[PDB]
């Protein structure tokens, strides 16, 4: 890999759709250093996008590994985002408490 990002944070605003013709589940992952950053995660593939939409929840803590992508937009006719598609990337929910 020439392009690898790992982020651990809290999930928000999960939603699902189509960017172009690809199905995508997108969510915001807040990382915190003591500095907050609100990263846009996009999970691609009909099955993976549905797995993420279905089983990842608002407020879950996750570790994401994916690629940093820069889609310029700003110009016709989320600039930065993390592309997660297996087997290159994954989302791991970390479960605890109670």
């Amino acid at each position, epitope marked *: 890999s020439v392009n690898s990002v790992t982020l651990v944070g809290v999930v928000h605003d999960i939603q699902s759709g189509f960017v172009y013709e690809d199905a995508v589940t997108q969510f915001t992952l807040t990382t915190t250093s003591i500095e907050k950053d609100h990263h846009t995660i996009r999970c691609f593939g009909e099955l993976f996008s549905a797995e993420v939409k279905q089983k990842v929840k608002e407020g879950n803590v996750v570790c994401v590994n994916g690629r940093l992508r820069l889609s310029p937009q700003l110009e016709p006719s989320y600039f930065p985002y993390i592309q997660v598609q297996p087997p290159h990337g*994954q989302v791991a929910v970390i479960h605890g408490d109670r």
Partner: nanobody
Amino acid sequence: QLQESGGGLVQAGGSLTLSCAASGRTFSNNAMGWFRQAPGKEREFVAAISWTGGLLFYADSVNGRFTISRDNAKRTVTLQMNSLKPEDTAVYYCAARPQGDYVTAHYDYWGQGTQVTVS
């Protein structure tokens, strides 16, 4: 039908690789999970992996020491356990086809279990 293997007696600091071989019926298109049951405790979540392998769940007590993976060719789920502790002593059970959230012990199919004891 699901069959665990790879269990064993191991010393603290050690590693092990557990494996679950699965029938087409239980594995295909299905999320797969590992649970464990320690002496005197109800069984608890360890790790789970979606059909695509892109979505993983880890118990916070195991996160960053254990890795779950699956091989959709061999119909296997693997649990690589690193940095084992006494508290990891349990029978470990593979499961397939969760009825709800991947983290709760409600699955259509269960293995018979495999012992892991860490001295």
